[PDB]
Structures are given as structure tokens and as C-alpha cells.
Design a binder for this molecule. Structure first.
Ligand SMILES: CCCNC(=O)[C@H](Nc1ccc2c(c1)CNC2)c1cc(Cl)cc2[nH]ncc12
Lengths: 156, 39
């Protein structure tokens, strides 16, 4: 059905009423989202049906209809924007300057914005308007505030 | 069964809410895709 480039809500009816479990990005006819959101399950778009194509539980990423398409990266200097799509609320761009996640395999950016679980999979944009990652997989620090990583997948 | 609904365009909005800090955290990623603090 709807293959339009843009940010989408991932919804379910298995629970009470309509519930937003996550968010995702559609680009080049491919839907990109965090793995913990769908658990690799098939999606529906009107009478159309999206099937998983690629996935990885460690990276916490999953693409539908095709391979991963998002490839822009944070330059480690500039301010980025989180395109937050909260459950039952309008999409709201929140400009922030990312932090750092020092891991044994290298550093990756981190957005320190606090949102409900149903917001997982919200794109993080650069100044041109390119998706440099997905917000939704991170850790809770000392003062209870949430810090998500800037999760990006590998293009082929 | 899950389903998708469009929510907007992917555009940078000039003059948007500038908030949030930039912390340097030492973290660890496990086989299950979960992050954890390292101290
Ligand atoms: C306690 C910090 C870790 N939790 C998260 O990152 C949450 N998502 C998430 C849940 C399950 C799995 C993963 C990720 C990956 N591996 C399985 C999560 C995201 C967001 Cl945006 C707001 C949240 N509020 N509470 C949890 C929460």
C-alpha cells in the first residue's frame, strides 16, 4: 500500500485499543526500524504487507522490503535533530548536540533526550536532512535520565 | 498483528527546540543487543 518516504508509527491491536510500540523510517522503498520494536514480525500498510529482509539482534536493527538503505553518519562535531514521534502525539524536531558511547569496539554518538518506549525507532537527522541513525537503544544513567545511542546500519 | 501509519516528512526544522546535554559514557554492548554502564 503506502510506500511514501517518511517517518511512520509502528502500531499493534493485540493489547488494549491501538498501541504504538515504536517508530520507523521509510526510504527507497525500504522500512527501517529497531529490532526490539517488531521482534522481526511482518508489518501491514493498508492492504499491503511488509516482510523482514535483513535483521540483527545485537545491532538492534531490521529492514523490510529490502536491504538497509540509511548510510549518513554523525560528523562528531555538529548538532543533530531527533525527529521524535511520541505515542499519540505530533512529530516534534528536537535539536540537540550528541554525546559519546565509548565502547571496546569504538565510539558512537548518543542523544540524551528522554522519551517513552513507544518512540523507539525515531530518526536522527543531519543539517542536509539525512538519517544518521535511529533513537531507541541505550542506557539509563545515574540520575534516571535516558541516553540512547545513535544506531546506524551498514549499507551494501 | 502490527501495522504502520505515516507520521511526517524527514526534514530538519530550522529554529526548533534546542535541548539536551552531551555526555561521555563508557558502555558495553552484549550479544542480546543490550547496553550497560561500565565504571
Ligand atoms: C533501560 C535502558 C535500555 N532500554 C531501552 O533502550 C528500551 N528499548 C529496548 C527494549 C528492549 C531491548 C532493547 C531496547 C534492545 N535489546 C532489547 C527503551 C527505549 C526508549 Cl526510547 C525508552 C524507554 N523507556 N524504558 C525503556 C526504554
Amino acid at each position: 500500500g503506502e510506500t511514501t518516504d517518511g517517518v511512520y508509527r509502528v502500531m499493534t491491536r493485540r493489547l488494549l485499543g491501538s498501541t504504538q510500540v515504536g517508530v520507523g523510517v521509510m526510504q527507497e522503498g525500504v522500512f527501517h526500524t529497531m529490532w526490539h520494536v517488531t521482534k522481526g514480525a511482518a508489518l501491514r500498510s493498508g492492504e499491503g504487507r511488509l516482510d523482514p529482509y535483513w535483521g540483527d539482534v545485537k545491532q538492534d536493527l531490521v529492514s523490510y522490503c529490502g536491504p538497509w538503505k540509511l548510510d549518513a553518519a554523525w560528523d562528531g562535531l555538529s548538532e543533530v535533530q531527533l525527529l521524535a514521534v511520541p505515542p499519540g502525539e505530533r512529530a516534534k524536531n528536537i535539536q540537540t548536540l550528541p554525546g559519546i558511547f565509548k565502547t571496546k569496539d569504538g565510539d558512537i554518538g548518543a542523544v540524551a533526550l528522554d522519551y517513552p518506549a513507544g518512540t523507539s525507532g525515531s530518526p536522527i537527522l543531519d543539517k542536509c536532512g539525512r538519517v544518521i541513525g535511529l533513537y531507541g537503544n541505550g542506557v539509563v544513567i545515574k540520575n534516571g535520565s535516558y541516553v540512547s545511542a545513535i544506531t546506524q546500519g551498514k549499507r551494501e | 498483528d502490527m501495522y504502520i501509519e505515516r507520521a511526517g516528512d524527514i526534514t530538519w526544522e530550522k529554529d526548533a527546540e534546542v535541548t539536551g546535554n552531551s555526555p561521555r559514557l563508557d558502555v558495553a554492548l552484549d550479544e542480546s543487543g543490550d547496553f550497560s554502564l561500565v565504571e
